[PDB]
Amino acid sequence: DGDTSKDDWLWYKQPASQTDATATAGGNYGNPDNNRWQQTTLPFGNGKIGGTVWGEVSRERVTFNEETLWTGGPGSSTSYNGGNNETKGQNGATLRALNKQLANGAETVNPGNLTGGENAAEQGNYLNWGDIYLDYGFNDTTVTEYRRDLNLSKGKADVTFKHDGVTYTREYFASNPDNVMVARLTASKAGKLNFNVSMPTNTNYSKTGETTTVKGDTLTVKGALGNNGLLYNSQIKVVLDNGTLSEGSDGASLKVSDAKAVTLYIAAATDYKQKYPSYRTGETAAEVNTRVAKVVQDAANKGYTAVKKAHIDDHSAIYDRVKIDLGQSGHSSDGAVATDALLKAYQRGSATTAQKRELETLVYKYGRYLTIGSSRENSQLPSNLQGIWSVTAGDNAHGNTPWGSDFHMNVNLQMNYWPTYSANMGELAEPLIEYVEGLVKPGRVTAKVYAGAETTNPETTPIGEGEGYMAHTENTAYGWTAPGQSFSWGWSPAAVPWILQNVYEAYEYSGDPALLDRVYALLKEESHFYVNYMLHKAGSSSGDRLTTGVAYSPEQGPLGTDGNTYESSLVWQMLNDAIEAAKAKGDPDGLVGNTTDCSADNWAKNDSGNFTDANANRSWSCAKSLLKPIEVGDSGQIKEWYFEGALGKKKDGSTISGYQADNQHRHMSHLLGLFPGDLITIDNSEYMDAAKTSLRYRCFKGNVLQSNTGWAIGQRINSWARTGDGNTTYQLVELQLKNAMYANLFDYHAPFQIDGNFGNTSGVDEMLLQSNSTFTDTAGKKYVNYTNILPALPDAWAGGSVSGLVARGNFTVGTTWKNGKATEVRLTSNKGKQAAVKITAGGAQNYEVKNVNAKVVTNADGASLLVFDTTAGTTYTITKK
């Protein structure tokens, strides 16, 4: 390992079984062992397989996952159709009738028939694969010199202790380049390494024809999921250093005896494929077997040293892109404390400043680490509710695993990909882009059933050229794009618009023309879908505007209103982004249009759902201009519903049915225009005071800050950051670390939900750098996606530095500050785009740039930007005059 004193570690002086697991367990974790798993174990992965290390003395345990072990989908029934219910949808007639009731003046309608997804065996869920047990068979677990750690920098978990005079060590990592999990096990005296290795599958999912067999140095477990026939195969190849290897007496394990060091190569795979409609590779069980055996064989052929080197090089190339120094201590500090002890001191308010900055920076860093472990460029699937890490397993949705550890697209999956670009991991978004592309074919079925949008030739019609694809909140590995069996969580077609922000951002941050074309195709077809099938002139309940028709605001208030701020803000952003994408391509399709002869009356349709006037302006620019997503209510708040009066009330003073009466609703579905969107910004700030008001009510009772789920706090951190109020933002960071982090630094809802880990990383980035807003100088000139240095810097962080953050337009950003003001900015232009740099903590007019002909422009607020041409590859240093 060499010098690891500068590496980032989570570290513990005792095994998981002796680590504090006393925080709220949450749903599905009533079993003490499962609860211990989520609070205390340490995760690693290669985007595809993953482990969670217990670090037990005698019976060591690594809980094992592979990303595609999903029940549900084709083969789970003889009629799997993505959950779509034709009798419910009626080819769009059910929705059309409901929207007509709204347009005619209803405030609410009963959307109870807009459901699908009734068979929980078809929906399925993500499964814990099983565990690897390394049973040392010690007579007692008495040890000294015990440490377990996770080295975030090298992308490995370590265990060491001394037992009866002998030092045992363990090291675990999962290589992306060699697609293999590695366990390096050592004893300090020859002959003293003795253990049994087995890999039991989780006992709670049904199985068909599973066998566990040993041939030579290799243990193989293989079967088919009883729920859907999915083939699975895992293998452990045990390579003794140049000791004894025997078949375990149970015939289901391997026995290493009288050894000193061994390397285990672990691989696993299924025959899953993200390929509609079959979702299989077509391999036979023998083929998957051969494939998996070759993985471990190729790895062994390369050998431990070379595999480990290629892994650390691969991991660290991404992990080391970003450095942050807020004055933290670390594991090699005098008086360094273990991570569980750090957490406890932080929660009790006894942590020193250096210790507070250690936990804060470790949590930040862990969100980046966790992206690398769960979401690689070659992962078949994006990160799910738990990344890739789980201990729970059952056959059916809404079963033994909370929310199926699924792809949840009414905030959670989005939050997973909030830090991915700004924290310099842009390539790791690729599985999300492919996933969303993967929704187009099944979602055209949903679009046709529920909105009457039928794409002909749905198999050969390219993305961008269809009539629309529709998906809702709960999604899976298998194009489960139907609405849920209950509307009040299940129906949410704006999920697609919203996840298309995360996708569009891949181009916004890179300027890559291959991405431009991919994101343009998606936006074009989803915009067409909404303009042609979803939008209508509102009824009297929602005033004068286009709305999206029957809607629910996740996840509170009335069912089936005439649009809402959530859906309008989202559709506005989508049309915004679609227009930007079209412009960048020279508008080849002529879809941008204009606001000429533009009216909500342009959307009039006949009884059969076709536009009355074929020639009327329904262009993207027109539609966008008619949404008017934002209104301020009687309490000075952003309204969540257009019939809103005061906060939580209707115009006539009556409460809004189902509004969460304390004001602490976890979702803030009506503030998406502030974060992640570009609708309410520090520049376009007509509604910033109302946004802040709304935020205060959502987080505070008087002057007392309220707690919430980890993800709800993660959204609040990001939203406060966009306001510029760095002090309040930081109160939320602190609240998250005190109330929503287990001892292993897993974010919790409860239970463990990874969303809030990625929300934390994003929220910190947004404190130090923003790049989403548009500046308008006093001459009227526009600077779109300008680089905003230290926009929400808390007084708690008076000095520090960060390097390697990414701004839209593709600029890498480093900044150092002291006494609350930037002392240096380093701006690397990766694409040659003109720079426009605001310095919120210091004022850009007070700085000069070197490599430079930089002009200062000012807005009516008195805010200044530095503006200068750049060359791709060049870094510009900005310092105070």
Ligand X SMILES: C[C@@H]1NC[C@@H](O)[C@H](O)[C@@H]1O
CB 98, CB 111: distance < 8 Å = yes
We find the least distance from the C-beta atom of residue 292 to Ca ion, in angstroms, to be 18
Among 172, 711, 797, 876, binds ligand X (CB under 6 A): 711
Binding mask 541-580 for ligand X (x = CB under 6 A): --------------x-------------------------
Residue 51 or 367: which CB sits closer to ligand X? 367
Closest CA to 668 of 635, 689, 643, 699: 699
C-alpha distance across the termini of the chain, in Å: 45
Residue 687 C-beta-side C-alpha neighbours within 13 Å: 22
Please state, in angstroms and rounded to a whole number, the distance separating the CA atoms of residues 87 and 575. 32
381, 535, 546, 849: which one binds Ca ion (CB under 5 A): 381
Residue range at the interface with Ca ion (CB under 5 A); choices 86-94, 456-464, 556-564, 678-686: 678-686
Question: Which of 763, 769, 855 shows the shortest CA–CA distance to 815?
Answer: 769
Separation between Cα atoms, residue 732 and residue 792, nearest integer Å = 13
- Known binder of ligand: residue 374? yes
User: Residue 227's Cα: distance from chain center in Å?
Assistant: 27
Secondary structure (DSSP) of 734-749:
HHHHHHSB-TT--BBS
Q: Which residue number, 555 or 848, has a Cβ lying nearer to ligand X?
A: 555
Burial of 112 (0-12, 13-18, 19+ CB in 10 A): middle
66 is in an annotated binding site: no
Q: Please, is 608 exposed, middle or buried when counting C-beta atoms within 10 Å of its C-beta (0-12, 13-18, 19+)?
A: exposed
Residue (of 176, 369, 136) closest to 259 by Cα position: 136
For residue 720, the minimal CB distance to ligand X (Å) is 19
Asked if 384 and 47 touch (Cβ cutoff 8 Å), the reply is: no
| CB 401 within 8 Å of CB 126 | yes
Judge whether 510 is annotated as a binding position: no
Taking the complex as a whole, how short is the minimal distance between the CB of residue 515 and Ca ion, in angstroms? Answer: 14
After which residues does the chain become discontinuous at a C–N distance over 2.5 Å?
242, 851
CB atoms within 10 A of CB 663: 17
Pick the binder of ligand X from 709, 761, 770, 864 (CB under 6 A). 709
711 contact, one of Ca ion, ligand X, none, CB 5-8 Å limit per kind: ligand X
In the list 71, 84, 220, 379, the residue contacting Ca ion (rule: CB under 5 A) is 379
Residue 405 lies near Ca ion (rule: CB under 5 A): no
β-pair type (244-247, 847-850): unpaired
**Segment contacting Ca ion (CB under 5 A): 376-384, 457-465, 484-492, 721-729?**
376-384
678 is in an annotated binding site: yes
Nearest-approach distance from CB 421 to Ca ion, in angstroms: 11
Residues in 612-671 at the binding interface with ligand X, rule: CB under 6 A:
666
Placement of tokens 């989005």 in the chain: 414
Yes or no: say if 412 and 498 are a contact pair by the CB < 8 Å rule. Answer: no
How do strand 787-789 and strand 847-850 relate by DSSP bridges? unpaired
314 binds, among ligand X, Ca ion, none (CB under 5 to 8 A by kind): none
Pick from 54, 80, 319, 403: which binds ligand X (CB under 6 A)?
403
Q: How many residues belong to the site for ligand X (CB under 6 A)?
A: 9
Binding test (CB under 5 A) with Ca ion, winner from 7, 56, 67, 747: 67
Pair 695, 722: CB distance under 8 Å: no
Which of 224, 385, 674, 822 is in the footprint of ligand X by CB under 6 A? 385
Residue among 99 and 412 whose Cβ is closer to ligand X: 412
* Contact code string over 291-320 relative to ligand X, x by CB under 6 A: ------------------------------
Judged by beta carbon, residue 314 or residue 567, the one nearer ligand X is 567
Q: Is residue 67 annotated as involved in ligand binding?
A: yes
Measured from the CB atom, the residue of 484 and 629 that comes closer to ligand X is 484
Distance CA 569, CA 409 (A): 16
Closest chain position to ligand X (CB): 403
- Should residue 408 be labelled a site residue for ligand X when binding is judged by CB under 6 A? yes
When the beta carbons of 633 and 710 are compared against ligand X, the nearer one is 710
Residue of 198, 270, 328, 412 that binds ligand X (CB under 6 A): 412
Nearer to Ca ion, 67 or 135 (CB): 67
Nearest to 418 by CA among 532, 338, 501, 355: 501
Torsional sign, CA 313, 315, 319, 321: positive
Size of the site for Ca ion (CB under 5 A): 5
When the beta carbons of 220 and 416 are compared against ligand X, the nearer one is 416
Draw the binding track, 733-752, toward ligand X (x: CB under 6 A; -: no contact).
Answer: ----------------x---
Question: 742 near 38, Cβ under 8 Å?
Answer: yes
Q: If phi over 0 gives left and psi between -120 and 50 gives alpha, with beta otherwise, what is residue 68?
A: alpha
Q: Which residues bind Ca ion (CB under 5 A)?
A: 67, 379, 381, 388, 678
Binding site, annotated residues for Ca(2+): 67, 374, 381, 508, 678
Residue ranges in contact with ligand X by CB under 6 A: 385, 403, 408, 412, 555, 666, 709, 711, 749
- Binding-site residues, in ranges, read 67, 374, 381, 508, 678
